[PDB]
Symmetry: D3
Subunit: 282 residues, 6 copies
Amino acid sequence: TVAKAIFIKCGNLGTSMMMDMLLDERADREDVEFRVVGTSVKMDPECVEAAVEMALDIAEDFEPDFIVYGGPNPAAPGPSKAREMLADSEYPAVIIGDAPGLKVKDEMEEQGLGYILVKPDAMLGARREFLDPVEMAIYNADLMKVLAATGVFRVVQEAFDELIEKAKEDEISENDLPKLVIDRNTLLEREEFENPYAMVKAMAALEIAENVADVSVEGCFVEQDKERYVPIVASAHEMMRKAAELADEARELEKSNDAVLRTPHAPDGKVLSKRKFMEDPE
Amino acid sequence: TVAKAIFIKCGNLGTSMMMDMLLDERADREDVEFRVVGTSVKMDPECVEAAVEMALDIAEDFEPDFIVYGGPNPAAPGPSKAREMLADSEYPAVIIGDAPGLKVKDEMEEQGLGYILVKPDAMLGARREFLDPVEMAIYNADLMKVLAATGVFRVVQEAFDELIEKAKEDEISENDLPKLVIDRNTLLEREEFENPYAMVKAMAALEIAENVADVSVEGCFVEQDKERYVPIVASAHEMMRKAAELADEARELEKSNDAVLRTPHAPDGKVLSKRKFMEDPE
Amino acid sequence: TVAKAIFIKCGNLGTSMMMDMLLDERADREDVEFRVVGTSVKMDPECVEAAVEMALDIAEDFEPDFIVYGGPNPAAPGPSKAREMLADSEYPAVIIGDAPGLKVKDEMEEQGLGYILVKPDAMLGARREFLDPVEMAIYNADLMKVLAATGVFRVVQEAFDELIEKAKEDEISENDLPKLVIDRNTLLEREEFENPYAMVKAMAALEIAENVADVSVEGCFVEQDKERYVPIVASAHEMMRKAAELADEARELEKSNDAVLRTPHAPDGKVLSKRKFMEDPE
Amino acid sequence: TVAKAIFIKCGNLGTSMMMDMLLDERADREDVEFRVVGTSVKMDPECVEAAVEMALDIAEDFEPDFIVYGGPNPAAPGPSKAREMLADSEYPAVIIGDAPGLKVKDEMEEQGLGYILVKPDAMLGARREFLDPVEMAIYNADLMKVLAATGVFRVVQEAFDELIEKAKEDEISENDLPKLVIDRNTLLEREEFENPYAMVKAMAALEIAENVADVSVEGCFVEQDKERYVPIVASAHEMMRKAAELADEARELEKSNDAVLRTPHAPDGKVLSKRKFMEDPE
Amino acid sequence: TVAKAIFIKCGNLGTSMMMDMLLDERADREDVEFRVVGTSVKMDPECVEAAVEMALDIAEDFEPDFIVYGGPNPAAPGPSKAREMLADSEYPAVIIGDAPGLKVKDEMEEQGLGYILVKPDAMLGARREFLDPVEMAIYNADLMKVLAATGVFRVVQEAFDELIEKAKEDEISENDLPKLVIDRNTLLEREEFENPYAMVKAMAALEIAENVADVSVEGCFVEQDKERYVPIVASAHEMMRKAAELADEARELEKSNDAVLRTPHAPDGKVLSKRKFMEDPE
Amino acid sequence: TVAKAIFIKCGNLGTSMMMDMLLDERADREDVEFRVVGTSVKMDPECVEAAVEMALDIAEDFEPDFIVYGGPNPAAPGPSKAREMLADSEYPAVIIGDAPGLKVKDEMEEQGLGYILVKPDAMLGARREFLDPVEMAIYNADLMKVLAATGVFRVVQEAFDELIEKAKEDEISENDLPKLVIDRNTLLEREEFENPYAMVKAMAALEIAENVADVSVEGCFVEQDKERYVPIVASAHEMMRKAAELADEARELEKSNDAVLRTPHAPDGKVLSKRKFMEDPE
Ligand SMILES: [Ca+2]
Ligand SMILES: [Ca+2]
Ligand SMILES: [Ca+2]
Ligand SMILES: [Ca+2]
Ligand code: NA
Ligand code: NA
Ligand code: NA
């Protein structure tokens, strides 16, 4: 069977940027097929309706087993609009969001939606005096490094791989929808790292990343004096840069013991595994 | 006037991943509206066809001033189909590809398409023994850092901004379409860096990035013995990691002189410029 | 004209370890004379009582102009006994503590005590499984680098230097006593850094340093399973190491512009200042 | 049995700054109680005499098992006074000092004092044009990191732990007092490092730290021309910084093998040991 | 019982600079005797002819078993004359050169010469505006690091050691003369690295080092505008600096496993081997 | 005129390896011609006398303006033979050596010889258990970076350039001969670094390099237990590696100010100067 899903991207989060690609890293999967639609960075109610409508329009022919809405702050006006529309749709739907989604965790279960809220997927320092396209991409670069090297992306990968296998027995029930909150302590229940210091360095990275959001929030929404708010948002970016360096250090430790976890997909979709560099994944 | 555009994303490149976001870094532009559609990592002809048909169906209602197709290797079977379909459509169109696109540069011109070919946007080590979702993401983080901190995204950003200004006087002649090839020497014609060492560091990072593609191609397409091809593709990833490190050192040099170029969009879409941290974009 | 003071140290904080030394960095001040007493790391009620009694015993002959009590958490049972005893004594007194001291800031004002509360002077990860004497020292080394390179210790230096001038003009009124809370945003009202990026890196280090506190608290007092709390307290120490690296990076940027603020004391206690390596402090 | 000691601190040394805290790193030892007295940075004969009288007064009632005097240059006029007073006293006494102390090593033995001379505990660059309080603290941060991560603090910790055992067993004989000189080669006879390159990095760190002393000495007491002595003392500080870097590198190497030695105290004072991050100290 | 050889050096390459020393690292071999002659950096025909004459003049009394010529580009006019003169001589001879030498590989075989062509021994950025003596020597330091830490020099050592052993049986036929081309992929048939990530980092380093050559050639022989060619040659140097960093990283990874290959010669010239730091080579 | 010199190399030092090359870094000097002869690493009296013979034979027809003998320790038996032979000969001669040469500095002046003694050009750890060819090369790479980037090689370049200009007014009399001792403090009398922190980082590198010599001597000539001398020699290498890192950091500081001093030769021999990257050397 070919399992299918539609991904909807409104606004930008590090996780929503990569979510579809984590499931087919070499485009060699024979068991899945995805369509991806969105309105780029705009996530006002007008644009978000427009984007979900598109997805629902596509869904008529594509017939996906589930839909995913990925974007900042599921509690915001435009994202709230998407949850409602997806709540009302026949389609199982999963919401990927950041820490502010916690305000509506309770609502989302009520609405029968699944969710993955990634606390270290932090808001950047969005002030005109500091944030231009290059700085925005540099931030995302650092953030991607953190969410990848700490193993956060593997948690998301595994959630969706589990969902996809259930879709292959065609019956995704709401009992099957992910309900995950990801943060520093998530690493404590995983077997991601063979070396414990790699693990603690990743935890440190995730803690720093999750602290960034507080700083960005003070600089964009609270501080009104530019002499103070520009330095504040800039410090946020400096923190994320160090978070990335910590995550790289963790990965380098796993390398020093030839113990880097790789979990690639096989053409049939099965998730393989390996630790040693020259061992075949199995 | 509002310039409208549809981005189509099949397979993945550093540039195609950020291209739309580079144009509206704080989602505060009042002069642009975007739709994004794609098939994720799949870029076989059948999926690319579906992808382009999705944009054309959305365009009837949306009325894009131009369409951007973004993805690896414009010469490959899938992208070549996209070029035929877009070349045939009523909408002006731009192809964003990597170095392999050079094989068909003359054709795209003969097709009346624009293009932006980014040579440092290198193909990764796509072998199952090595590239899992986490590795794919780490490679993308490093590559994003390289394209952003060396100023490649700024070159892309300006080319689209020039096109958008022309879309607003509604008449994009095929003469309005970018026809760019970006590589190491692109930095020579720019005033990105105030410090010459930052510039030559960025150049070195782009050189290394472009060299990575040849390593990946040998490991993925030429070498058939896994005992050889797995280390080959891995070595390619170690190179991109060091390019990202050069790119970061360049940026740090610019910070050390309070000379970081920032070119944020104003809400009316105008590109502003500043160098000193506490100076107002203007 | 010779200011005299006693310093009492119960338990350890980065600031309390250095506070006296920061006032006579080459032992060549002829305008000060200090005594230091304490109970080492012990800060239980009976130990603090003993330290304070020690200070008051030698105060009889020494005649200090003021007394400084320095250590962890002023709202804890031990330091609370210190505050009570020092408030009721005849001597002007200042309490040096960390962020937990905020709980009793009003009360200290009511007691007629001065205070300097250093929020980045974060509690370390005190679990036996992890914290041995070497790890304790390594932590203090990183914290000390953070407090110093960011300029936190200058702010401490300046508050004491003003207090001491008042002491010499013999009239330390309650209105003379410091009432400082130091945090990341303290940098915004100072002129420590010539280079703005140095300033924002130092902000980031103070922000991370402050966040180490919560993590330590979680690991030592909240989490009760050692499979979880050991990794938690270790991640706090990795955070602090990286904050120290930010602080270093900020100091290297100042060196790059030959703009390192130095404010040494003259023999008569006047605080001089210089920026350029080769310039004399004046 | 509770062993009791008084620690006397005149002037500053990395080792005397931490000596007492090294013995009770989580403040949970039930077999020791300490008092700490001193005159901060001042160590002329007047101030040392007053610090020792403070210690001897307290000793009347506190009744310590031993007294420790810590600070720079045991052969200097102040510290020489402290040696004469302690040697003539009824209390066993240990002198902690630095390399210059070797000049009176033989005298200290005839005086019946213990010593611990730490050759890497080097004098900093004390010239007004360079050393302000922040610089002073940055140096100590670096030296502390060297003394800690190299195992030097462990060697000191163990010496006092042995002496404490003797004390709880009523027989502090002259023959049980420490007689140590610590340097690079000290590491050759211990088992601090599981990895031999960590050991040799550590050894290099100690050698550099020892050599720093010679540079400071030249800059402070030999060279009289400011155009020469300011760069000299500054260069000594850059050396210590890179010694701290080596020591960090040593520790990271141990982390890579999950072999970090930790020797924390039990509540009853027993020195436990472990190497694996997740194992109980035993 | 002894092997004798003359080394002739015209111009400079990393391999040619170290080639003799690699064979007697402690000056304690009893089974070899060398002479070295050259014309320093000059490798024009007149100079090379003078070099080879000296060698051939020395050879009359010295009776070498073989002669080595080492220098840039075996295919240029000078080196070409050395090849003919040495091939027409009665002495077996080996040419050590860089990648341009591939142009005359078949000519050398037809000449009866051996060769070792090192592709990563890359020409530097030889433009007056940039290359002074200090910059030349820095490039060389970086390049030496690369060729050494990656194991290229060990391949060279082994090639020359095999020839020395055959020469101790006086009969070097042409067929015994090495015929080697060394590049990134040479590592895949070696067992230099115990850790596979050290290996792939080494590969990366050698790839980058080989790419440097193309940059230099462009900057020295193609580009004529100084505003362009000075950035270009400096960029090549930044690349080599990062290759050396990669090679260092690789060697550190091997230290972290106590698995650094060392292959010293015994006094009788036997090539020993060890892996573990403390173990005698056998 | 065309100045001519012959360089004799017996033993290896950093300085003697590069000495001839620092004078014609691009081989485009039309005013010098050099011959180089040596016995490679061997510097016993029999080899040294063979080396000098080669040189004097060639001189007969070559007619050099001066002769230079470079190698380890002028005081040892071989180089002592060189001094006597060169002192007796008709040719003005210069001895290049390390700190141990200071023992015969008086003697060399009596002999009418010039000398350049390089204190930082420190002996490596030559014990067979540690020092193989790759290790020997890695040492030399770090040492070369140190001597180059600190500006020691420039001082050497200058000395020799001066002597060459004297030869072109044809009269290298004995008082034209260099009598240089280079160490850390040499930097104090130079205007090498524009940034004062680069200067002091360089001094620290030179201090550490100089101290390496002592660790080497101890591990090769004093310590007899291999359990000890192996870590000891290896620790000397770790020190050199950090010295190389310090010198690199100094050069990056200069880069950050676009202030890298470059002193290339023009084709007629004139030493030119520049500091700005895009400036023509004059
Ligand atoms: Ca169709
Ligand atoms: Ca001056
Ligand atoms: Ca011979
Ligand atoms: Ca011929
Ligand atoms: Na915007
Ligand atoms: Na008074
Ligand atoms: Na010394």
